[PDB]
Write a protein that holds these residues in place. Structure first.
Motif, PDB file in Angstrom:
ATOM      1  N   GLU A 159      -8.427  -0.194 -13.915  1.00  0.00           N
ATOM      2  CA  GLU A 159      -9.451  -0.651 -12.982  1.00  0.00           C
ATOM      3  C   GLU A 159      -8.998  -1.831 -12.112  1.00  0.00           C
ATOM      4  N   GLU A 160      -8.199  -2.712 -12.703  1.00  0.00           N
ATOM      5  CA  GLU A 160      -7.669  -3.874 -11.999  1.00  0.00           C
ATOM      6  C   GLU A 160      -6.627  -3.485 -10.969  1.00  0.00           C
ATOM      7  N   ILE A 161      -5.771  -2.529 -11.317  1.00  0.00           N
ATOM      8  CA  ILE A 161      -4.775  -2.004 -10.401  1.00  0.00           C
ATOM      9  C   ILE A 161      -5.477  -1.512  -9.142  1.00  0.00           C
ATOM     10  N   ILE A 162      -6.504  -0.689  -9.306  1.00  0.00           N
ATOM     11  CA  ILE A 162      -7.262  -0.206  -8.153  1.00  0.00           C
ATOM     12  C   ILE A 162      -7.936  -1.350  -7.384  1.00  0.00           C
ATOM     13  N   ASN A 163      -8.488  -2.314  -8.117  1.00  0.00           N
ATOM     14  CA  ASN A 163      -9.125  -3.493  -7.526  1.00  0.00           C
ATOM     15  C   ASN A 163      -8.180  -4.333  -6.678  1.00  0.00           C
ATOM     16  N   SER A 164      -6.949  -4.509  -7.147  1.00  0.00           N
ATOM     17  CA  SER A 164      -5.915  -5.218  -6.413  1.00  0.00           C
ATOM     18  C   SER A 164      -5.682  -4.649  -5.016  1.00  0.00           C
ATOM     19  N   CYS A 165      -5.806  -3.335  -4.859  1.00  0.00           N
ATOM     20  CA  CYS A 165      -5.702  -2.722  -3.537  1.00  0.00           C
ATOM     21  C   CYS A 165      -6.900  -3.057  -2.653  1.00  0.00           C
ATOM     22  N   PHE A 166      -8.104  -2.956  -3.203  1.00  0.00           N
ATOM     23  CA  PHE A 166      -9.309  -3.343  -2.469  1.00  0.00           C
ATOM     24  C   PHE A 166      -9.338  -4.838  -2.123  1.00  0.00           C
ATOM     25  N   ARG A 167      -8.782  -5.666  -3.004  1.00  0.00           N
ATOM     26  CA  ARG A 167      -8.854  -7.112  -2.826  1.00  0.00           C
ATOM     27  C   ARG A 167      -7.925  -7.538  -1.706  1.00  0.00           C
ATOM     28  N   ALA A 168      -6.714  -6.990  -1.710  1.00  0.00           N
ATOM     29  CA  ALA A 168      -5.758  -7.190  -0.637  1.00  0.00           C
ATOM     30  C   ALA A 168      -6.151  -6.535   0.681  1.00  0.00           C
ATOM     31  N   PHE A 169      -6.469  -5.247   0.635  1.00  0.00           N
ATOM     32  CA  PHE A 169      -6.472  -4.463   1.857  1.00  0.00           C
ATOM     33  C   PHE A 169      -7.858  -3.962   2.225  1.00  0.00           C
ATOM     34  N   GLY A 170      -8.849  -4.142   1.359  1.00  0.00           N
ATOM     35  CA  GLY A 170     -10.235  -3.746   1.662  1.00  0.00           C
ATOM     36  C   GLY A 170     -10.544  -2.264   1.546  1.00  0.00           C
ATOM     37  N   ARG A 171      -9.544  -1.518   1.084  1.00  0.00           N
ATOM     38  CA  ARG A 171      -9.653  -0.080   0.949  1.00  0.00           C
ATOM     39  C   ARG A 171      -8.551   0.461   0.046  1.00  0.00           C
ATOM     40  N   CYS A 172      -8.763   1.697  -0.410  1.00  0.00           N
ATOM     41  CA  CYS A 172      -7.759   2.416  -1.196  1.00  0.00           C
ATOM     42  C   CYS A 172      -7.804   3.900  -0.841  1.00  0.00           C
ATOM     43  N   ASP A 173      -6.787   4.398  -0.144  1.00  0.00           N
ATOM     44  CA  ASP A 173      -6.876   5.760   0.379  1.00  0.00           C
ATOM     45  C   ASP A 173      -6.037   6.740  -0.425  1.00  0.00           C
ATOM     46  N   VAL A 174      -4.955   6.244  -1.013  1.00  0.00           N
ATOM     47  CA  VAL A 174      -4.128   7.125  -1.803  1.00  0.00           C
ATOM     48  C   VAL A 174      -3.667   6.398  -3.057  1.00  0.00           C
ATOM     49  N   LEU A 175      -3.420   7.221  -4.072  1.00  0.00           N
ATOM     50  CA  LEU A 175      -2.958   6.774  -5.376  1.00  0.00           C
ATOM     51  C   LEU A 175      -1.806   7.696  -5.769  1.00  0.00           C
ATOM     52  N   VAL A 176      -0.640   7.129  -6.051  1.00  0.00           N
ATOM     53  CA  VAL A 176       0.487   7.903  -6.531  1.00  0.00           C
ATOM     54  C   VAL A 176       0.718   7.473  -7.975  1.00  0.00           C
ATOM     55  N   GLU A 216      -7.927  -0.090  11.401  1.00  0.00           N
ATOM     56  CA  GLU A 216      -7.084  -0.598  10.279  1.00  0.00           C
ATOM     57  C   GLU A 216      -6.329   0.491   9.511  1.00  0.00           C
ATOM     58  N   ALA A 217      -5.135   0.109   9.078  1.00  0.00           N
ATOM     59  CA  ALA A 217      -4.190   0.961   8.382  1.00  0.00           C
ATOM     60  C   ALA A 217      -4.692   1.311   6.984  1.00  0.00           C
ATOM     61  N   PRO A 218      -4.365   2.528   6.526  1.00  0.00           N
ATOM     62  CA  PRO A 218      -4.718   2.892   5.163  1.00  0.00           C
ATOM     63  C   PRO A 218      -3.862   2.207   4.107  1.00  0.00           C
ATOM     64  N   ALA A 219      -4.356   2.225   2.871  1.00  0.00           N
ATOM     65  CA  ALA A 219      -3.688   1.620   1.727  1.00  0.00           C
ATOM     66  C   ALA A 219      -3.454   2.581   0.568  1.00  0.00           C
ATOM     67  N   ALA A 220      -2.265   2.481  -0.025  1.00  0.00           N
ATOM     68  CA  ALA A 220      -1.901   3.282  -1.185  1.00  0.00           C
ATOM     69  C   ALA A 220      -1.524   2.386  -2.356  1.00  0.00           C
ATOM     70  N   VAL A 221      -1.835   2.852  -3.559  1.00  0.00           N
ATOM     71  CA  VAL A 221      -1.277   2.331  -4.798  1.00  0.00           C
ATOM     72  C   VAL A 221      -0.164   3.258  -5.294  1.00  0.00           C
ATOM     73  N   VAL A 222       1.022   2.704  -5.530  1.00  0.00           N
ATOM     74  CA  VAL A 222       2.086   3.441  -6.197  1.00  0.00           C
ATOM     75  C   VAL A 222       2.413   2.765  -7.532  1.00  0.00           C
ATOM     76  N   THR A 223       2.399   3.532  -8.619  1.00  0.00           N
ATOM     77  CA  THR A 223       2.693   2.961  -9.928  1.00  0.00           C
ATOM     78  C   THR A 223       4.191   3.011 -10.159  1.00  0.00           C
ATOM     79  N   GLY A 224       4.700   2.102 -10.979  1.00  0.00           N
ATOM     80  CA  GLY A 224       6.128   2.029 -11.228  1.00  0.00           C
ATOM     81  C   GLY A 224       6.846   2.153  -9.901  1.00  0.00           C
ATOM     82  N   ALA A 225       6.610   1.230  -8.974  1.00  0.00           N
ATOM     83  CA  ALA A 225       7.102   1.377  -7.609  1.00  0.00           C
ATOM     84  C   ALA A 225       8.261   0.442  -7.288  1.00  0.00           C
ATOM     85  N   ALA A 226       8.744  -0.295  -8.280  1.00  0.00           N
ATOM     86  CA  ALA A 226       9.738  -1.342  -8.064  1.00  0.00           C
ATOM     87  C   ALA A 226      11.094  -0.739  -7.771  1.00  0.00           C
ATOM     88  N   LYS A 227      11.343   0.445  -8.325  1.00  0.00           N
ATOM     89  CA  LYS A 227      12.665   1.055  -8.252  1.00  0.00           C
ATOM     90  C   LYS A 227      12.615   2.561  -8.016  1.00  0.00           C
TER      91      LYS A 227
END
Ligand SMILES: NC(=O)c1ccc[n+]([C@@H]2O[C@H](COP(=O)([O-])OP(=O)(O)OC[C@H]3O[C@@H](n4cnc5c(N)ncnc54)[C@H](OP(=O)(O)O)[C@@H]3O)[C@@H](O)[C@H]2O)c1
Ligand SMILES: NC(=O)c1ccc[n+]([C@@H]2O[C@H](COP(=O)([O-])OP(=O)(O)OC[C@H]3O[C@@H](n4cnc5c(N)ncnc54)[C@H](OP(=O)(O)O)[C@@H]3O)[C@@H](O)[C@H]2O)c1
Ligand SMILES: NC(=O)c1ccc[n+]([C@@H]2O[C@H](COP(=O)([O-])OP(=O)(O)OC[C@H]3O[C@@H](n4cnc5c(N)ncnc54)[C@H](OP(=O)(O)O)[C@@H]3O)[C@@H](O)[C@H]2O)c1
Ligand SMILES: NC(=O)c1ccc[n+]([C@@H]2O[C@H](COP(=O)([O-])OP(=O)(O)OC[C@H]3O[C@@H](n4cnc5c(N)ncnc54)[C@H](OP(=O)(O)O)[C@@H]3O)[C@@H](O)[C@H]2O)c1
Ligand SMILES: Nc1nc(N)nc(NC2CC2)n1
Ligand SMILES: Nc1nc(N)nc(NC2CC2)n1
Ligand SMILES: Nc1nc(N)nc(NC2CC2)n1
Ligand SMILES: Nc1nc(N)nc(NC2CC2)n1
Lengths: 252, 253, 251, 251
Positions: D73-90, D1-12
């Motif tokens: 904490e919820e932002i990080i949780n949203s990645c785990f809830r969707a993708f089951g993992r969180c490998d990077v945070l920007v 399975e592919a890794p998952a990242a959170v990017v903040t302010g990522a809309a633009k």
């Protein structure tokens, strides 16, 4: 007895302000100079007239060469010969001119030797001899440059020399701390501009300074040196104090 | 056609890893060396076996002297004469040994070797590099600096001054050569490959200090950062120095 | 008349040494304090004994909150209320404790205390100072020589002190045209906490190149005094380490 | 399975380039946004059209408050809830506007600028790390090449970014034993809005040695990708400027 200091390139401007303020504080000084013999000897006469046998001169080229080690050893020796001690060393002597990477008519080897010699290698050999002969408030202070991380266009060898001086300051502070010798720096931004500097050439740099929109006086730079040699700076080593009126904080 | 790189002190360790990775990416390399002739020639052979006419050697002492400008000009010239171009320069060669301020080389020699190799040679190399370019590629220079320059080893004052000077060239040259399209950047190891003649006990002492892994960097790890800096993915990056130190410079005494 | 200074967390240790040395040089002082009321009043009494009407106290929590701006405004106001002027501001007050990233205070409280005291209060104090304005006006911020080599698990402290560095630079820049200089003093190991073991104190001491000892509070105050003096009148945006070489020592 | 990242302010702009570029390299992305709902959803659509179930959105205000810890904490949780993992945070989200020392309140100026640029990044890092407690885990923080020569009247912004530098170092140090690298990328002038004045934009572009122009968002993202990549496996506590030499230019 009174302590003694060596100030390099001390005949004029900032080196002179340093030597005079040290003298005013009760140090005997050796006034090193290179080409400025009249001003060097006029200055030592002024200081000896105030207090007899408290100033001596010492000429030496600080260009890097096979003989620089011996020249620097001699400068330190002059202080011991005259005054029987050496408590402080101020590395103020410095060449400063442009050295473009891409094309004054000197050769590059001569550029290297004058800019790296005066700004770094001489300081190092001076520090070495200073330290060796220490056999208290012993300290060294190096004249650096607040703008090293935002350097002038085409001054790569100068800038390289001053950065070397900062590393000498840290390295020497570290190593000589166990001998009680403190090593610190003072980093001007725009201080005395060459008397040549067309009064509106100056203002182009003066207008850049947030504190006052003026250059530092030589005396203001010397104030920081005096503080660093003083008993008020007893715990301070490896420190470089900028006296730049905010100039290095100003973005392009 | 394929671009060319000059790598100094490229015969072994980190320089070799840099030249190997640049070759693997399609560069023709000039492998400069000083004393390591058998390794330099053995390496060029390996790379030319992989791709004919892609590696050449260049011997030169980079101790400071009145001839060092000439030696550095020649190093660059050897790249143009072999490959018709010079696209990147890696200033990797470096002397490193203690130079106590107090308690068999002469100080003149200590100065000329440490300041020459770590700073003056890089300056001169950079000048010849820049002068030989046109007045249409991804031209850049990368300098092998040192993550520990603000927390230096005891009694390595001349080495440290050389590295600090290299930092200042990096900045100065980035600034001055940006208008020629030439980027200038640095990679700053902490503990990477260790001495041959230090004991495992002392090697372990340095290893234990690295927060990321308690291990030194592989030469390939260092080379990775060089490769990034030379690549098209770093085309706006100049004046930057990347430490590759696993956190070691963040550790207080 | 005599100039006046505000010194935050001035009741004991380094802040006290700063306020006494400032007083010794002729300043009237506001001794700010938070919990240390007995020591604050005992110090103001000692200084008023030496020179009547020269020391006053000021209690204020410098934890971040929506009333912090008002607290910091009041601190400055106390100086103008007592002495009619405010020439110097020393931001010395600081919270310091570990805040592990992988864990009795809540994180919201750890943030508000460590970031408020070490950074936001300083910012708000400098705003108030500046808005309320012969003289030599300056600010001195107490920083930390080890910010680039921080203690393990002190991330919020370290962030506070790095933020103080930035205020120093940003304020120096902006306030230079008002004649107000802004500088810092960055100790390494100075006075150790009374709850530390003597064995663990000695471990830090043996790390200091210059003397294998911590700085005295006076030694730190010396550098503050220099920065407020007429000998530093071209110095702004500058932070002076007073660390005996500690930050130059590798791991 | 592919890794998952959170990017903040990522809309633009740069956050978007980061997310796109991570997605292009095979990451599943959580696109955090604040007010830019339509761009966030439009981006998640584009990425899911390219590869189904690989992009999700998550709204949160990153202003400092009593509830920020929870939000982060919820932002990080949203990645785990969707993708089951969180490998990077920007940590890219950031407020940026002047805050002179002399229509918002200062309490709000503080909470927005220090929250977005520093405290949120800390809390994200805390949650990221706690949820971890083959694999290439890292954090990359969007810093600012100009923090030491900051813009006039941006005290709180600059304090934020300096704080972010401190977190970068502190977290690198503390999380290195968990295998989590922490690094930064420091732009100088990258996207300048076409609403900002052509004269003022030209002044800024003219100041850049390398090209006399701003970085593209993609150029900034290139540096982010390098740091998350396996080519940066020994790199931690490092901040890479991507400023075209702008910070080396004196006044
Ligand atoms: N003025 C400034 O704005 C400024 C700014 C930043 C840093 N600094 C630093 O502050 C220091 C003093 O500045 P300044 O402007 O007073 O310096 P300066 O006038 O340019 O030079 C100081 C002295 O250096 C000596 N010198 C030059 N070449 C020499 C050589 N080859 N061998 C031995 N001595 C040599 C000269 O001595 P002789 O005349 O006797 O030949 C000269 O009087 C320097 O370290 C400088 O880089 C100054
Ligand atoms: N290894 C580390 O932990 C470490 C740590 C921090 C920084 N660095 C930096 O990383 C770089 C590579 O490190 P390294 O350990 O691979 O280097 P190294 O083995 O110490 O030296 C590399 C080469 O430099 C050449 N060299 C030395 N003196 C020379 C001279 N006078 N003239 C011409 N060439 C000379 C030598 O070539 P020959 O063998 O052919 O004579 C040597 O093989 C250096 O720039 C270094 O300062 C390394
Ligand atoms: N001591 C060192 O080795 C060292 C090292 C590096 C830097 N420094 C810096 O130098 C300065 C002084 O150090 P120090 O050791 O003297 O500090 P300290 O004793 O730890 O702090 C000085 C004062 O800070 C005040 N304070 C704490 N929390 C507060 C809060 N929430 N609101 C308002 N005030 C609060 C306290 O005031 P009250 O007791 O009245 O409540 C305390 O007496 C600080 O900025 C420190 O960060 C010290
Ligand atoms: N562009 C540049 O020249 C430049 C230069 C130096 C440094 N940087 C740094 O690089 C990064 C990206 O910059 P950029 O210019 O693309 O950024 P930007 O447009 O100013 O901001 C990026 C995003 O941050 C989010 N944000 C703002 N306030 C927020 C809040 N209270 N809560 C949550 N999110 C909030 C916004 O999301 P919403 O739209 O969804 O509201 C915004 O779209 C930033 O870290 C920045 O400080 C940029
Ligand atoms: N930075 C520096 N260094 C020397 N040696 N001399 C000078 N002179 C300044 C042009 C007045 N400046
Ligand atoms: N040139 C250089 N610079 C450093 N830091 N380390 C080394 N180590 C190699 C074992 C000689 N070489
Ligand atoms: N505010 C502050 N900052 C540091 N670095 N150290 C200390 N020591 C005090 C005893 C806790 N206090
Ligand atoms: N340094 C920084 N930080 C943010 N969030 N935004 C910006 N926007 C600049 C106007 C392009 N700059």
């Amino acid at each position: 007895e009174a302590p003694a200091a060596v100030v390099t390139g001390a005949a004029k401007r900032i080196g002179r302000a340093i030597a005079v303020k040290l003298h005013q504080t009760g140090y005997r000084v050796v006034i090193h100079y290179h080409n400025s013999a009249e001003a060097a000897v006029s200055l030592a006469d002024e200081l000896n007239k105030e207090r007899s046998n408290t100033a001596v001169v010492c000429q030496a080229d600080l260009t890097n060469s096979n003989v620089l080690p011996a020249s620097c050893e001699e400068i330190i020796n002059s202080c011991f010969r005259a005054f029987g001690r050496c408590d402080v060393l101020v590395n103020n002597a410095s060449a400063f001119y442009p050295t473009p990477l891409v094309q004054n008519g000197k050769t590059v080897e001569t550029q290297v030797a004058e800019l790296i010699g005066t700004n770094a290698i001489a300081p190092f050999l001076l520090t070495m001899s200073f330290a060796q002969r220490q056999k208290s408030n012993l300290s060294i202070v190096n004249l650096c440059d607040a703008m090293v991380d935002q350097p002038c266009m085409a001054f790569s060898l100068y800038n390289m020399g001053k950065h070397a001086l900062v590393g000498l300051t840290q390295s020497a502070a570290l190593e000589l701390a166990p001998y009680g010798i403190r090593v610190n720096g003072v980093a001007p931004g725009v201080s005395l501009l060459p008397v040549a500097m067309g009064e509106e050439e100056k203002d182009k740099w003066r207008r850049k300074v947030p504190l006052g929109r003026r250059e530092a006086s030589a005396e203001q730079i010397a104030d920081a040196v005096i503080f660093l040699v003083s008993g008020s700076a007893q715990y301070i080593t490896g420190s470089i104090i900028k006296v730049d009126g905010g100039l290095s904080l100003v973005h392009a």
